[PDB]
């Protein structure tokens, strides 16, 4: 009979030289550290008002993971990772009503390595204004999940697509959505 | 493209009945495979796969190393649980409820937290336990869930349909009725 | 309150 789980998850990937450090509570991200700006980014602004975390520490663990990756790469005789393509899903935040603010959620799940290209498309054209996303979230099977969001005003005329590129896919994957 | 090599580490804190019982795990991964771990219920590192034996023997041979990890349930888990308890374990957000037709009658429950929830369908005061299809609990990745519970029926005049949602955030059952 | 991280051990060379 389990109740709660807190996870401090981290990773480092070569040749990309990309690392990640974050805390997770029952599946949701509490925060992660932006390695570049060297600061803590809270998942919800409110969180950062009651707690804090020494961001620099994340860099210390990451530096050890780099050294560890090299050590493990050699131990395994340079055995590369096997690409696992993502499963992609598009849905809205809530019931859609014409002319009422909503949010399209593009869910990328069960994939590795932690590298993807995600682009929102409205009537075939790329959309960036107002979009946001999460870092790579850990899965209990050690693959990853990721969320991309697009706030929008529903119309009978607009059509949307979440395009996802991953080395595990022979070709880009497109998940479609339109006001039914 | 060129081969990728991934290293992951997961420090997990499993809490049961608050902090009365706590289990700590220091997990190491090469790509998607866990090769070595320390389980606080075991007391020392153990190889998960042959690849991790070197690390188990190495780390286990250092009294000070094991000493620190054995005290992690206290110096790490319990401390962190207390830090964010007010905005995580105690987080509460109301279920937004909307009932619309689709032949189906859909009850969309949105924006709630925590995740455990009870959604039941009623007709003229009598619960409909057959012909109810739920999409399951859907995580929005922003500390809010959503779920759609459909009732397979042919809406008719004179008939009263009610969706009843029970959730920790609400003091008493939330009901929304729909009529054709 | 302040969150504290857990250390990541360096593997055996």
């Amino acid at each position, epitope marked *: 009979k389990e109740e709660h789980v807190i996870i401090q998850a981290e990773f480092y990937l070569n040749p990309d030289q990309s690392g990640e450090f974050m805390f997770d509570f029952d599946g949701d991200e509490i925060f992660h550290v932006d390695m570049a700006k*060297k600061e803590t980014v809270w998942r919800l602004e409110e969180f950062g008002r009651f707690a804090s975390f*020494e961001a*620099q*520490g994340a*860099l*210390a*663990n*990451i*530096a*050890v993971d*780099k*050294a*560890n990756l090299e050590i493990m790469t050699k131990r395994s005789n340079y055995t590369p990772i096997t690409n696992v393509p993502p499963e992609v899903t598009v849905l809205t935040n809530s019931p859609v009503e014409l002319r009422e603010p909503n949010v399209l959620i593009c869910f990328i799940d069960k994939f590795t390595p932690p590298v993807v290209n995600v682009t929102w498309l409205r009537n075939g054209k790329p959309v960036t204004t107002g979009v946001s996303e999460t870092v790579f979230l850990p899965r209990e099977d050690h693959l990853f999940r990721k969320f991309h969001y697009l706030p929008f005003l529903p119309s009978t005329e607009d059509v949307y697509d979440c395009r996802v590129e991953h080395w595990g896919l022979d070709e880009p994957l497109l998940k479609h959505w339109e006001f039914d | 493209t060129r081969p990728r090599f991934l290293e992951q580490v997961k420090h997990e804190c499993h809490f049961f009945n608050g902090t009365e019982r706590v289990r700590f795990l220091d997990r190491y991964f090469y790509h998607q495979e866990e090769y070595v771990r320390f389980d606080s219920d075991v007391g020392e590192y153990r190889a998960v796969t042959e690849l991790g034996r070197p690390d188990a023997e190495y780390w286990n041979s*250092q009294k*000070d*190393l094991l*000493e*620190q990890k054995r*005290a992690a349930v*206290d*110096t*790490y888990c319990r*401390h962190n649980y207390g830090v964010g308890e007010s905005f995580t374990v105690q987080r509460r957000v109301y279920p937004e409820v909307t009932v619309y037709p689709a032949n189906l009658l859909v009850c969309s429950v949105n924006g709630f937290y925590p995740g455990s929830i009870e959604v039941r369908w009623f007709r003229n005061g009598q619960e409909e336990k057959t012909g109810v299809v739920s999409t399951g609990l859907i995580q929005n990745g922003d500390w809010t869930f959503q779920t759609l519970v459909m009732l397979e029926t042919v809406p008719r005049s004179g008939e009263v349909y009610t969706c009843q949602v029970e959730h920790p955030s609400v003091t008493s059952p939330l009901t929304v009725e729909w009529r054709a | *309150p*302040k969150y*504290v991280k857990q*250390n*990541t*051990l*360096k593997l055996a060379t």
Partner: T-cell receptor
Framework: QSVTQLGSHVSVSEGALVLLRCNYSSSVPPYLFWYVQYPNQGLQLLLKYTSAATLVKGINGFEAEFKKSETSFHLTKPSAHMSDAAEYFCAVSESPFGNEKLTFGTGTRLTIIP | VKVTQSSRYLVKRTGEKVFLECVQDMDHENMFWYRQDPGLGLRLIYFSYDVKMKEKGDIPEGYSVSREKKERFSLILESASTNQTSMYLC????????????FGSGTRLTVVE
């Protein structure tokens, strides 16, 4: 985090009681260290508090008790020996092994009067 | 397990640009620079947890560092001033290691006009 060592210079007659003060401030699980610098030598770790035990016994006959309530970690020794003349430094850290930045006290110079 | 500092002693003139070296061959990820002065103990000037990483300590003013290679952590005095006359201590460690600081032999630097 912070540490303070009330008493920069302390004189003790030999055979007497040695007491060097160390107080700390920490909003996270504390890990304290006592370093000693004998003349013409580099800092040596005397003992440390890892939370494994409240009473820590160190080398060279020294002892220290972690008192969460008083937020203290005083270094003490029953009988002062002429070879204890040195400078003692108290330090605090957020890491369990003292491998990430340590914050040092101002230090105390211990003089033994024969 | 040794941390070696370039010089044991140095004399430099005000305004000059001074370089204090620190190198360790243990593949430690963490290196720090502290200055030691009577009645002030050890004060953290700058520290680094990885290659190219620089973090201001508690008294960075007047100094700067450089961590281009993991093995070396250089402390730099842009325009040396007399109040920078002190005993500089280098230390190295790894967050992934079951023990702490490894101090260097120190570097006595006196800045004269």
């Amino acid at each position: 985090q912070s540490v303070t060592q009330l008493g920069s210079h302390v004189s003790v007659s030999e055979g007497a009681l040695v007491l060097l003060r160390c107080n700390y401030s920490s909003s996270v699980p504390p890990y304290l260290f006592w370093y000693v610098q004998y003349p013409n030598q580099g800092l040596q770790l005397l003992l440390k508090y890892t939370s494994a035990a409240t009473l820590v016994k160190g080398i060279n006959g020294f002892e220290a008790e972690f008192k969460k309530s008083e937020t203290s970690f005083h270094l003490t020794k029953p009988s002062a020996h002429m070879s204890d003349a040195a400078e003692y430094f108290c330090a605090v850290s957020e890491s369990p092994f003292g491998n990430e930045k340590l914050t040092f006290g101002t230090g105390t110079r211990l003089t033994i009067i024969p | 397990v040794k941390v070696t500092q370039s010089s044991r002693y140095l004399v430099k003139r005000t305004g000059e640009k001074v370089f204090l070296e620190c190198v360790q061959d243990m593949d430690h990820e963490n290196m720090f620079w502290y200055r030691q002065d009577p009645g002030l103990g050890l004060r953290l000037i700058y520290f680094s947890y990885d290659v190219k990483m620089k973090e201001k300590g508690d008294i960075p003013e007047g100094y700067s560092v450089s961590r281009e290679k993991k093995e070396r952590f250089s402390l730099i005095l842009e325009s040396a001033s007399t109040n920078q006359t002190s005993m500089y201590l280098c230390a190295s460690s790894s967050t992934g290691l079951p023990y702490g600081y490894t101090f260097g032999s120190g570097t006595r630097l006196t800045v004269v006009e």
